[PDB]
Design a protein around this ligand. Structure first.
Ligand SMILES: *[C@@H]1O[C@H](CO)[C@@H](O[C@@H]2O[C@H](CO)[C@@H](O[C@@H]3O[C@H](CO[C@H]4O[C@H](CO[C@H]5O[C@H](CO)[C@@H](O)[C@H](O)[C@@H]5O)[C@@H](O)[C@H](O[C@H]5O[C@H](CO)[C@@H](O)[C@H](O)[C@@H]5O)[C@@H]4O)[C@@H](O)[C@H](O[C@H]4O[C@H](CO)[C@@H](O)[C@H](O)[C@@H]4O)[C@@H]3O)[C@H](O)[C@H]2NC(C)=O)[C@H](O)[C@H]1NC(C)=O
Ligand SMILES: *[C@@H]1O[C@H](CO)[C@@H](O[C@@H]2O[C@H](CO)[C@@H](O[C@@H]3O[C@H](CO)[C@@H](O)[C@H](O[C@H]4O[C@H](CO)[C@@H](O)[C@H](O)[C@@H]4O)[C@@H]3O)[C@H](O)[C@H]2NC(C)=O)[C@H](O)[C@H]1NC(C)=O
Ligand SMILES: *[C@@H]1O[C@H](CO)[C@@H](O[C@@H]2O[C@H](CO)[C@@H](O[C@@H]3O[C@H](CO)[C@@H](O)[C@H](O)[C@@H]3O)[C@H](O)[C@H]2NC(C)=O)[C@H](O)[C@H]1NC(C)=O
Ligand SMILES: *[C@@H]1O[C@H](CO)[C@@H](O[C@@H]2O[C@H](CO)[C@@H](O[C@@H]3O[C@H](CO)[C@@H](O)[C@H](O)[C@@H]3O)[C@H](O)[C@H]2NC(C)=O)[C@H](O)[C@H]1NC(C)=O
Ligand SMILES: *[C@@H]1O[C@H](CO)[C@@H](O[C@@H]2O[C@H](CO)[C@@H](O)[C@H](O)[C@H]2NC(C)=O)[C@H](O)[C@H]1NC(C)=O
Ligand SMILES: *[C@@H]1O[C@H](CO)[C@@H](O[C@@H]2O[C@H](CO)[C@@H](O)[C@H](O)[C@H]2NC(C)=O)[C@H](O)[C@H]1NC(C)=O
Ligand SMILES: *[C@@H]1O[C@H](CO)[C@@H](O[C@@H]2O[C@H](CO)[C@@H](O)[C@H](O)[C@H]2NC(C)=O)[C@H](O)[C@H]1NC(C)=O
Ligand SMILES: *[C@@H]1O[C@H](CO)[C@@H](O[C@@H]2O[C@H](CO)[C@@H](O)[C@H](O)[C@H]2NC(C)=O)[C@H](O)[C@H]1NC(C)=O
Ligand SMILES: *[C@@H]1O[C@H](CO)[C@@H](O)[C@H](O)[C@H]1NC(C)=O
Ligand SMILES: *[C@@H]1O[C@H](CO)[C@@H](O)[C@H](O)[C@H]1NC(C)=O
Ligand SMILES: *[C@@H]1O[C@H](CO)[C@@H](O)[C@H](O)[C@H]1NC(C)=O
Ligand SMILES: *[C@@H]1O[C@H](CO)[C@@H](O)[C@H](O)[C@H]1NC(C)=O
Ligand SMILES: *[C@@H]1O[C@H](CO)[C@@H](O)[C@H](O)[C@H]1NC(C)=O
Ligand SMILES: *[C@@H]1O[C@H](CO)[C@@H](O)[C@H](O)[C@H]1NC(C)=O
Ligand SMILES: [K+]
Ligand SMILES: [K+]
Lengths: 368, 338
């Protein structure tokens, strides 16, 4: 009785789900029960993900607020897409970025009710403008922004800076990134001339600096491939910032995840978001989802979906307790001791079945 | 029945207590009034010392210990004549927040000494001290003899080895720092310090921003510290102005465990500010001597939660919140039939 269930669910009506096509109600494409389409507790867009919208031009305006937050997305940025900034880049670096972004988002959404995006603007002294240096055939990155070399500079060994302000959120997730390798200015430069990308963000109000230097020696050629963007994901407080670049192109945030409304700690729930077997998936959301801030839920069957619908079907009702092992429907007794339980959780102590008169035989004239 | 108790406790024998009290034994068996746990292998404690004191100052006690359930028993300084103890209250809150949070994740806490490689002739200087204490972490290295002022870059290397993570201080004098006796009264410095991980390219930086000084007319200049959790490897301390500073001691964190909140009991509320969910449960127990704590640690409890400890694992009047162990239900459940 009251074995833990492999579902995502909620303790009460105070929940919210972020998703992709498989929860996008605008119905053969859905894993989400159609009855939850009019719930007002879903932000989902087919073909998109939080990571995709965070970094690229293909943007969906995700937003939602809830005590118990659930995620069922990620797949729309995978190794099957094979995104890389440059012809001889490296998707593995982008899987790394994915993992670090989601780890930060999951961890913070255990501590805040509200997630949304804000656009970040900057003030810059020179004449140069953004350049779309990181892109491939199907995607164009636009966060961070990269500002070109000023006309008068002969090479990329220069300091450059711009100001940016974070306002309107309790905390902001921003990327701080470098091309990690021997970056090249042009093909007119000799072979042995390369750059070591350096970027920092400085909080002018507090005096705290976050810095990042390239350390690798991979390049953007068939002889020495692997140069791509390595990103860290910082949770910053509102204030006035300075983006200070010590070498190569100045970069700074164009978008932030907006975190609002602190709550008592409540772990997020994550549903594994993958393709079918014959297409390339990743487990970056699994690495990102750790105790104590996240419960990971996966099925036992390949994506071919019956099993994932029943995992999401937990969203149609309330449960007493959400724990490491799963959801406990009832609040009283169970065979398992809940670990990391939230809600009104059952005991696994021996409490027998009680009655003032125990029944042994059927009564021919009285029902039970 | 089974009301939560406002005490620190343990779920099993795998616990450890860090303290600032005397744990030693002073010696018809009932004439022996020592607590059973006197001289226990599960306690690291020293009267008139603390983890913070030993982290930062010369009167050092070699605190170390290992356990699943970690417990802290918590039983003013300024660097300069016209400094500010408020900066040290803030330092203490930030130190303990980091220590408490990380000891929810590791079994083992100890101290290591950090050595450094510096290319000049200058030596350490005890610039931060008052009448009873002398700071020695971080180390501050003197200006080189050939420099006429404190507007210089300086650096040293240091290595962190043998632990999973290391807690170290990154600090600056926050205000208008002053150089020597005979120079313009309007000539001051803006202390700037950073640590750089040479293996990963990550830099942690800190610049002074206040305008306070070290005189009766303009007091407030003191040391503001951040407490970093660093991975093992090769580092460089890079100072962009004023005295080079770098760690001389680190908290060594080893042996990961499943997340298990620490417990803190007292007797300033900085340990209270530092002790927060999800990583720490704060108890304000009343009689509160160390000897009574020792007696209260002889027996297990079934469940440790936000409201307190629940002795029994079956039923209670309260729903445990943020419960660990084997926790009772408060559901409305006489002879057993089945
Ligand atoms: C912890 O809380 C739970 C939930 O509240 C509680 O479980 C309920 O216990 C009550 C009271 O005993 C049960 O109600 C009685 O059920 C008698 C019939 O029992 C059989 O059928 C039950 C109904 O099954 C249907 O519905 C359920 C879900 O609703 C579903 O799972 C089934 O598939 C099916 O659709 C069934 O629950 C029950 O199974 C339990 O008991 C058996 C036998 O001991 C055991 O083997 C199982 O493991 C399981 O525990 C069983 O198969 C019925 O005769 C009885 O009616 C008399 O009493 C009521 C008042 O109590 C009078 O109104 C009536 O006129 C009769 O005199 C009563 O309705 C209820 O079914 C339980 N619900 C569930 C989900 O298990 C536990 O007791 C709580 N535990 C503690 C320690 O507090
Ligand atoms: C949760 O766990 C606790 C701790 O184990 C448990 O509390 C204990 O309950 C038992 C059973 O009631 C208590 O023992 C009783 O003590 C009373 C008075 O002191 C006695 O009179 C009782 O004896 C009568 O009932 C017996 C039934 O077999 C008869 O044989 C006898 O003739 C008497 O009529 C009985 O022994 C015990 O005192 C407590 N312990 C504590 C520390 O409070 C509790 O019941 C558990 N609850 C649940 C819901 O499981
Ligand atoms: C992170 O990367 C940046 C960018 O490379 C580093 O800053 C740069 O440091 C280099 C090497 O110290 C400086 O170049 C040197 O200049 C001296 C003096 O002219 C010269 O003698 C050397 O041959 C060398 O060319 C460069 O000026 C400096 N750039 C800027 C804009 O400050 C930075 O040091 C790295 N950070 C860390 C902590 O290592
Ligand atoms: C944090 O603090 C350090 C130390 O103050 C800052 O580095 C220093 O910055 C000052 C002001 O930008 C630099 O002084 C300048 O010198 C040039 C060259 O003579 C001159 O053109 C300017 O008028 C000014 O006086 C100084 O060189 C620099 N010192 C070192 C050793 O790098 C640092 O910039 C601060 N960090 C941030 C993010 O603001
Ligand atoms: C899940 O639990 C919440 C928690 O109460 C339920 O909220 C109630 O919703 C009903 C709508 O039928 C309102 O009339 C009540 O006022 C709500 N109760 C409270 C205490 O706010 C919700 O209905 C439950 N949902 C399901 C599907 O069982
Ligand atoms: C995209 O989403 C954001 C966040 O939900 C919207 O911005 C909010 O708009 C409301 C007005 O209804 C303001 O009161 C809030 O202050 C805004 N929040 C933030 C964080 O900026 C925005 O309107 C949406 N964009 C579009 C085109 O619909
Ligand atoms: C941040 O920028 C985005 C994209 O420019 C804004 O979303 C667009 O808003 C315009 C109107 O200003 C609409 O025409 C589009 O429908 C929106 N685009 C998408 C893809 O949703 C968004 O409003 C901005 N956010 C805030 C808080 O101002
Ligand atoms: C506190 O709890 C632990 C775990 O339940 C007890 O350790 C067990 O002691 C029993 C005594 O016979 C042994 O059977 C087990 O082997 C022990 N288990 C483990 C995991 O060590 C411990 O004795 C209790 N301590 C006190 C003082 O009651
Ligand atoms: C950035 O802000 C600083 C301080 O507020 C100011 O000195 C500087 O002129 C600003 N830069 C630009 C380009 O607006
Ligand atoms: C992810 O996948 C790799 C194998 O590809 C495996 O070794 C690793 O343990 C997995 N991590 C998680 C968190 O599932
Ligand atoms: C989830 O389950 C599927 C099917 O068993 C498995 O192939 C996949 O690797 C699992 N994902 C993770 C992240 O463990
Ligand atoms: C101090 O404690 C450390 C860590 O437990 C230990 O390795 C060292 O030997 C101790 N020092 C002395 C002098 O006993
Ligand atoms: C650090 O230094 C102190 C004093 O020299 C010494 O007692 C202690 O044992 C040292 N730490 C270790 C791990 O040996
Ligand atoms: C510090 O390390 C650097 C980089 O390895 C090295 O070149 C330099 O010699 C070191 N400085 C000292 C004083 O040992
Ligand atoms: K840069
Ligand atoms: K310094």
């Amino acid at each position: 009785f009251n074995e833990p269930l492999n579902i995502v669910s909620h303790l009460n009506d105070d929940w919210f789900l972020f998703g992709d096509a498989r929860s996008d109600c605008t119905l053969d494409w859905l894993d989400l029960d159609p009855k939850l389409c009019n719930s007002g507790r879903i932000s989902a867009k087919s073909g998109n993900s939080l990571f995709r919208s965070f970094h690229f031009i293909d943007f969906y305006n995700y937003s939602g607020e809830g005590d118990q937050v659930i995620f069922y997305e990620g797949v729309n940025f995978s190794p099957s897409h094979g995104f890389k900034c440059l012809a001889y880049g490296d998707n593995k670096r982008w899987m790394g970025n994915k993992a670090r972004f989601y780890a930060r988002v999951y961890e913070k959404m255990a501590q805040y009710r509200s997630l949304s995006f804000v656009n970040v603007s900057y003030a810059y002294g020179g004449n140069a403008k953004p350049t779309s240096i990181c892109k491939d055939k199907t995607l164009t990155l636009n966060n961070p922004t990269f500002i070109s070399k000023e006309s008068n500079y002969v090479d990329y060994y220069y300091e450059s800076e711009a100001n940016f302000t974070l306002q309107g959120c309790d905390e902001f997730i921003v990327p701080l990134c470098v091309f990690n390798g021997h970056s090249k200015g042009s093909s007119s430069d000799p072979a042995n001339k390369y750059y070591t990308d350096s970027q920092s963000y400085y909080n002018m109000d507090t005096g705290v600096l976050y810095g990042f230097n390239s350390t690798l020696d991979v390049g953007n050629t068939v002889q020495n491939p692997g140069l791509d963007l390595t990103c860290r994901y910082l949770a910053l407080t509102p204030g006035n910032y300075k983006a200070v670049s010590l070498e190569y192109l100045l970069s700074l945030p164009s978008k932030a995840i907006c975190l609002r409304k602190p709550k008592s700690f409540m772990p997020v729930q994550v549903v594994d978001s993958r393709w079918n077997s014959t297409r390339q998936s990743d487990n970056m959301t699994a690495v990102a989802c750790q105790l104590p801030y996240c419960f990971f839920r996966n099925t036992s069957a390949d994506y071919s979906d019956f099993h994932f619908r029943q995992l999401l079907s937990g969203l149609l009702y309330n449960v007493s307790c959400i724990a490491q092992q799963g959801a406990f429907v009832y609040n009283n007794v169970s065979s398992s001791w809940p670990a990391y339980g939230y809600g009104h959780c059952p005991t696994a102590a021996n409490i027998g079945y009680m009655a003032p008169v125990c029944i042994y035989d059927s009564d021919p004239l009285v029902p039970r």
